[PDB]
Design a protein around this ligand. Sequence first.
Ligand SMILES: NC(=O)c1ccc[n+]([C@@H]2O[C@H](COP(=O)([O-])OP(=O)(O)OC[C@H]3O[C@@H](n4cnc5c(N)ncnc54)[C@H](OP(=O)(O)O)[C@@H]3O)[C@@H](O)[C@H]2O)c1
Ligand SMILES: NC(=O)c1ccc[n+]([C@@H]2O[C@H](COP(=O)([O-])OP(=O)(O)OC[C@H]3O[C@@H](n4cnc5c(N)ncnc54)[C@H](OP(=O)(O)O)[C@@H]3O)[C@@H](O)[C@H]2O)c1
Ligand SMILES: CCOC(=O)CCCOc1cc(NCc2ccc3nc(N)nc(N)c3c2)ccc1OC
Ligand SMILES: CCOC(=O)CCCOc1cc(NCc2ccc3nc(N)nc(N)c3c2)ccc1OC
Lengths: 500, 504
Amino acid sequence: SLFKIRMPETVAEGTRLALRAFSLVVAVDERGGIGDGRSIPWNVPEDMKFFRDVTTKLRGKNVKPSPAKRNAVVMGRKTWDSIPPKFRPLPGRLNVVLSSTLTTQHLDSIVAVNGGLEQALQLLASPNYTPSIETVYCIGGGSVYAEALRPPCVHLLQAIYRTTIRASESSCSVFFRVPESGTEAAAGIEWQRETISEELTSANGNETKYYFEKLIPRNREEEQYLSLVDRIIREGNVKHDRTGVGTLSIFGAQMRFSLRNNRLPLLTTKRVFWRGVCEELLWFLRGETYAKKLSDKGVHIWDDNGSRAFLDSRGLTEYEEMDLGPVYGFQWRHFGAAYTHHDANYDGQGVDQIKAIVETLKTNPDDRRMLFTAWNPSALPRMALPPCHLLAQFYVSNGELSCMLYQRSCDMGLGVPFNIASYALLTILIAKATGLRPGELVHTLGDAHVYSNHVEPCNEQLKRVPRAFPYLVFRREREFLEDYEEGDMEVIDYAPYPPI
Amino acid sequence: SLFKIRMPETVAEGTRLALRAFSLVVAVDERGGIGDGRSIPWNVPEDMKFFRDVTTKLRGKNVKPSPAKRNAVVMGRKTWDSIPPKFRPLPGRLNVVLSSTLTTQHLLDGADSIVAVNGGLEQALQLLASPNYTPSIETVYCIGGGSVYAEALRPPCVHLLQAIYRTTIRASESSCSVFFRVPESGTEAAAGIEWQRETISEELTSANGNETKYYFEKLIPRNREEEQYLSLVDRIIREGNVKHDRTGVGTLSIFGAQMRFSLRNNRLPLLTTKRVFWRGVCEELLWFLRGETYAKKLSDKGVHIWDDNGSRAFLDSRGLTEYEEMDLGPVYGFQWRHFGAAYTHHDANYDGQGVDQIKAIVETLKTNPDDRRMLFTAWNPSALPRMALPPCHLLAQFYVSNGELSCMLYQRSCDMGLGVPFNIASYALLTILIAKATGLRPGELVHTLGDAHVYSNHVEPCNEQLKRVPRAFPYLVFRREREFLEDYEEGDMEVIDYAPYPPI
Ligand SMILES: NC(=O)c1ccc[n+]([C@@H]2O[C@H](COP(=O)([O-])OP(=O)(O)OC[C@H]3O[C@@H](n4cnc5c(N)ncnc54)[C@H](OP(=O)(O)O)[C@@H]3O)[C@@H](O)[C@H]2O)c1
Ligand SMILES: NC(=O)c1ccc[n+]([C@@H]2O[C@H](COP(=O)([O-])OP(=O)(O)OC[C@H]3O[C@@H](n4cnc5c(N)ncnc54)[C@H](OP(=O)(O)O)[C@@H]3O)[C@@H](O)[C@H]2O)c1
Ligand SMILES: CCOC(=O)CCCOc1cc(NCc2ccc3nc(N)nc(N)c3c2)ccc1OC
Ligand SMILES: CCOC(=O)CCCOc1cc(NCc2ccc3nc(N)nc(N)c3c2)ccc1OC
């Protein structure tokens, strides 16, 4: 259509292919030895059990692994050779073998990959594997672990499950060490001990001592969110909202989130309603104002503010139910245009801020005026609500598009994580529209608050260790920005905590 | 005046200076001793000279102390007694003497250069805060005895202590029974203040017949707020991206930053490491507040900051060929007071046209301080092409807690060298004025920066500025008030105790 924004013919320079996140499972001795090059020297049945259990089990309670939903184990060919023929393939799991020589048919529970772990992580990110494969485990061996600890794979590592066997084995010629936080080899990742078992003794007849630990990469960006929540609780002033409900509040804060390689800052310590986020954002981008378009895909976030009662209380007696007035996206695409009803034609009316930004980004990336706003004092009384996230500015450095969001009023529990996700998506889409790579989201908060009745619940959430952020993958592209659908994209490896 | 904003009855109450700021001068031995209870038990003429000079001299070049402009020295009665009658009062300075028994008239029996205060340093600073002594007194110096120094180091006085000039005499006097010690960082005695050395002299020898070694130090309370600014400039120079603006001038740039400045108790965040043009700041903000668009109104007052953006050539270069010279279009203030109104020329009548954002905010601040919609903006996409320049400081949000007004500024494009310090001062003033208009006290300024940048040529200058240790901020007082916000003049307010570094 004539007033839509045409997408580029080609992807931005540098854009990666999709990659699954994975966990690493390993057994080491005290000097970091894992094997002689053909086998594992020690015999510790308890580690065998642990390795089987962790790689087999799914996040769901007592769920049985099936072709429909299972885990995948990724292994080097030599590790496949070390498994005695009668125990292979490893039951309940998709066995992924890395080999330049061997093929799948030299043997659907097995698949060969001509390439390293990166290629395996690419394969499992295919639409053929993403619905059925819940977690990917790097189970070895040495050359796979080495690759796993190396960019690009190392940034996709969710967790390391390391068993330490208290044995001295001079036959070990292959090694594995988790680089300590702050060290050069750590490559900017801060490894943390999440759990450690008590020191246990094997019933192998040698009384071999062993223990387990789970290591995770520190999610600094979510810690930044939790520190703010914690600060508000500890130091915020008591305030009351429009319905007289108590909040704890601070004024003026700022957070940052990397969107690089389509990383998606969906918070892990509380599940964020991504589908609603995505549907709403696309609805903004299209310049929509009819909330029924959202209620019909089961996104009910605007129901309360679109009701006959609420619109009437806002003086908006002429609007149909769910007609919100010239809100958000309308101002984005038609700033200043007169509003009558949602179903009217607004093509070429008001200022199309999104259109202008997309054109300036392509020709003059150093420009300092690439901002869009929904804060239109003239049109505020005509809106169901004044805009919360009201302003955004774009910035370009190193072929990466960054965005700053300004938000006047910020509910830390629900609004904030939702809006971080919205603008992450927006920045990713605008990057795609302009031939740029996604860069950084900066979030500026005005009145940042927690509900006084959510204090105890938030305190419980603050004890949770943040997990890694998921990634966003586009399964198909569109000719126009406005034609993107929620179904066009997939959030991969989002593993948030269950409800409080 | 129907369209103006009426000031409440409490207009002066929340910005009246409670205590005047002061510096401290002291001579100590190496055990922190200052005297034996009656006198100073050493004889160092070079300290006497320094003491005289630092307490007498005014900030300018060759400005002679006069009743209209001089320093004050504040002393305890015992210190006044220790001065030989021939030498008192200390010439060229207002002599403030603390005493429960001695009156102003009874002191003259031992122009108007002596005052007795019935009370301590707090009482003296209270008196010196009044219009009779502020701003005619340039710097207050505490010089008095141990009891006066002790009161200087504890709240409420200590938070107003701008500088400590300490002379150390290298002797150890058993005789000393009164002491003075500067508290170190993080200690309880320091009351959250972090004393820092600005200067230390080389060790010198006194011509007193005893070869007494001595030295001078000037200590200043760490200004963390100005250090936010300096760290940011340093970060930009170190790791900012190279960019070029519309003219093609080179820039070093980072994206997305935030700073905080306290406006409590008359504090004014005018940067000290480089002098800010306060008079310009003040004239322009008032000009903004009035919804003004004719830059000649600033020109006529010697404020030339808009001259180059209002010339015939520049307006033509933005396609604004129908504007009279200095007519900037619907810029800044016009949007604050008349958002969305159609613009023709500067001299037309805009009363009641568009949205008066400032007035709406003032009304909401008085009735519902909890409101989260208290914002104004100059970012009007439909009017941007009509403006000489689109606004860089483009949006502000107000917030209220504990009767204190805070403001958040959003700035899309920030020139760190000139624009940023100017805009901090601007929005500090705005928050102060809005607080006065709404019966609130000034709280905090929060400054959000988009494209924060330093010019590639300005790099070396900035680097020299970066090694300066920021001094304490000055204060803003009102000489008088007005019936209407729009009626405030630059001569109505006075920046006091502003001691910025020299240029270079
Ligand atoms: N303790 C533990 O936790 C643990 C776990 C697993 C294994 N292990 C031990 O690890 C030792 C063997 O490991 P190690 O690295 O020699 O062998 P490995 O990692 O098991 O396997 C290496 C083989 O995998 C394939 N491969 C790896 N990277 C590839 C790439 N980039 N492209 C194509 N193919 C690739 C190649 O097969 P082709 O030669 O066919 O091309 C390569 O020869 C054994 O002692 C085993 O028991 C220990
Ligand atoms: N080395 C230096 O830098 C330096 C400088 C100055 C003085 N000194 C030495 O300091 C020693 C004496 O100082 P010190 O404290 O005893 O004496 P001081 O501070 O000079 O004076 C104390 C007197 O000031 C008045 N005062 C103080 N606080 C008051 C309050 N809250 N309310 C009412 N009146 C108040 C009282 O006078 P009334 O009793 O009349 O009411 C009090 O007796 C001497 O040895 C002097 O030489 C050293
Ligand atoms: C006690 C050691 O003695 C043995 O090696 C068992 C005899 C061979 O039988 C098998 C070998 C393998 N090898 C791969 C392997 C083994 C243990 C691991 N543990 C951790 N923690 N992590 C691993 N990644 C891991 C990987 C896998 C399955 C087998 O049969 C079920
Ligand atoms: C080297 C000492 O020799 C004497 O004692 C001179 C004889 C007394 O004559 C005077 C005494 C005072 N006393 C107050 C005084 C003195 C020095 C100070 N220095 C610093 N750095 N700081 C002070 N606050 C200070 C305060 C003042 C003025 C006098 O006559 C001009």
